[PDB]
């Protein structure tokens, strides 16, 4: 009960999770925590094999053998400060014509659906990245714009403007636990308080 | 129709490279760039197979068949803003006594050597991570301390403090190119201009002398 082993996709594992963990451990100085950043596929493996107590991954995943909590967050467009797209309430694919859109080969279903959504839109030669965080870094430095999940965006909210994407595309987050896992109060408390933290943070910023 | 393909380890791929890339591409409007984050082992394969023009990996690495430029910088101690250790000139292992030191299990020789250097110090039950960026996030959020390479932590210096580590553990960065690969002026430009960008920034913060 003084053990908390977490496996998560690098998205949450590098943003919202360390942020919430910092608050969660204030009560518990003797708590031994492991926060491992893994691909979504290996996150499922870590939970199933018992190497991790909680798993966080990108949907979709096969549910057999797992207890799963889910969230769906609409796609948003991230633009530099003062960019003309900040003048809109809702950004369409056509509004991206002639922009330098950062392409994200992250391997998620979300990223793929996003790229086809803007498949016929004229654009300048891209910068193709492999991480959502890297894309946002380039937008912050003014190298272009990106289409993302809002959870990845929230730690860039000061130097970057967000707008809802006109195409209805949701990013699905999974909280994963083993259906035959060991009863744990600390895991119950963490998973419960994290979603509350997540939901409150997203709703406060008009992202949910 | 020039395309630049760069594979890099988390240390440079997450911070310094994107920041430099934004500057490098602004007056090259029709230049197409790919920046793929990969493990150091996969970076070597990316360069060896031609799937990447330039490679950036942790050291040491199998040199045979490559053209490699080397950087080596001392390990620094990353503490939260206003932490007690921020008032010290150098941080000794004994100075880290009773501190929450985020354990980094990244597979690098640097991180492994680091964990050996502080294995004789009694730490609080810390937080284990597999990503150096996760450790830096935790330091920023005030969750603990971390010994890390300066080039990966330089992007976090807005909210964290870097102090010299009294044990001289050097992180080795490699610029990797195919010895067989055809000559390229855009690559010659990027590689040398990046190192000047890297060196200047490290010197500006006393992380390089």
Among the partner residues A35, A130, A143, nearest to B127 by beta-carbon distance: A35
With CA atoms as reference, the chain B residue closest to A127 would be B33
Q: Which residue has the tokens 């195409």?
A: A167
Q: Is A15 in contact with B137 (Cβ distance < 8 A)?
A: yes
Among the partner residues A10, A36, A129, nearest to B35 by beta-carbon distance: A129
Give me the resolution in angstroms, 1 decimal: 2.5
Closest Cα of chain A to B191: distance in Å? 17
- Which residues of chain A make contact with B137, given a CB cutoff of 8 A? 14-15, 18-19
Element (H, E) at B104: strand B103-104
Tell me how far apart the alpha carbons of residues B112 and B115 are, in angstroms, rounded to a whole number.
5
Query: For residue B27, what are the CA distances in angstroms to A70, A137, B3, B53, B171?
Result: 44, 19, 15, 21, 33
Written as one string, the DSSP assignment of A180-194 is: TPPP-HHHHHHHHHH
Phi, psi at A173, each rounded to 5° = -105, 140
- β-strands A76-80, B32-37: how paired? unpaired
Q: Which of B2, B74, B49 is nearest to B176 (CA)?
A: B49
Query: For residue B164, what are the CA distances in angstroms to B89, B141, B173?
Result: 7, 21, 19
Burial B8-46 (b: 16+ CB within 10 A, else e): bbbbbbbbbbbbbbbebbeeeeebbbbbbbbbbebbbeb
**What is the residue extent of each domain of chain A?**
1-74+170-204, 75-169
Q: Which of B204, B157, B155, B175 is nearest to B66 (CA)?
A: B175
Q: Is A127 in contact with B34 (Cβ distance < 8 A)?
A: yes
CA torsion through residues A207, A160, A131, B29, sign: positive
Give the total residue count for chain B.
Answer: 209
Q: Is A127 in contact with B33 (Cβ distance < 8 A)?
A: yes
Cβ neighbours of B118 (radius 10 Å): 17
Instruction: Tell whether omega for the bond before A60 is within 30 degrees of 0, i.e. cis.
Output: yes
Tell me how far apart the alpha carbons of residues B78 and B162 are, in angstroms, rounded to a whole number.
5
SS3 content of chain A, % helix, strand, coil (to 5): 35, 30, 35
- Which residues of chain A make contact with B190, given a CB cutoff of 8 A? none
- Which residues of chain A make contact with B133, given a CB cutoff of 8 A? 10, 14, 37, 133
Tell me how far apart the alpha carbons of residues B92 and B101 are, in angstroms, rounded to a whole number.
13
Closest Cα of chain B to A152: distance in Å? 14
Q: Is B125 in contact with A32 (Cβ distance < 8 A)?
A: yes
Q: Which of B127, B78, B131 is nearest to B100 (CA)?
A: B127
Q: Is B25 in contact with A128 (Cβ distance < 8 A)?
A: no
Q: Is B32 in contact with A129 (Cβ distance < 8 A)?
A: no
Experimental method: X-ray
Q: Is A21 in contact with B127 (Cβ distance < 8 A)?
A: yes
Q: Which of B47, B52, B74, B69 is nearest to B194 (CA)?
A: B69
Tell me how far apart the alpha carbons of residues A11 and A39 are, in angstroms, rounded to a whole number.
10
Closest Cα of chain A to B79: distance in Å? 14
**Which residues 6+ apart lie within 8 Å of A9 measured at CB?**
A37, A38, A39, A40, A43, A56, A57, A58
Among the partner residues B25, B141, B143, nearest to A127 by beta-carbon distance: B25
SS3 content of chain B, % helix, strand, coil (to 5): 35, 25, 35
Residues in chain A whose beta carbon is closer than 8 A to a beta carbon of chain B? Answer: 10, 13-15, 18-19, 21-22, 25, 29-38, 105, 124-131, 133-134, 137-138, 141-143
């Amino acid at each position: 009960n003084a053990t908390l082993r977490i496996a998560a996709m690098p998205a949450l594992a590098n943003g919202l999770l360390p942020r919430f963990l910092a608050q969660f451990i204030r009560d518990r100085p003797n708590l031994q925590v492991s926060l491992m950043g893994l691909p979504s596929s290996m996150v499922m493996e870590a939970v199933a094999s018992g190497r991790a107590d909680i798993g966080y991954a990108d949907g979709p995943q096969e549910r057999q053998g797992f207890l799963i909590e889910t969230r769906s967050l609409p796609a948003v467009v991230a633009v530099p400060m003062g960019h003309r797209l900040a003048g809109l309430d809702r950004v369409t694919p056509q509004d991206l014509a002639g922009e330098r859109i950062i392409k994200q080969e992250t391997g998620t279903l979300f990223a793929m659906r996003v790229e086809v959504a803007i498949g016929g839109i004229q654009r300048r030669p891209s910068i193709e990245v492999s991480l959502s965080h890297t894309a946002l870094s380039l937008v912050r430095e003014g190298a272009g714009i990106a289409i993302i999940d809002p959870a990845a965006a929230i730690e860039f909210t000061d130097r970057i403007v967000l707008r809802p994407f006109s195409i209805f595309i949701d990013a699905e987050f999974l909280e994963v636990r083993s259906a035959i896992g060991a009863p744990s109060t600390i895991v119950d408390r963490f998973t419960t308080e994290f979603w509350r933290f997540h939901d409150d943070l997203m709703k406060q910023n008009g992202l949910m």
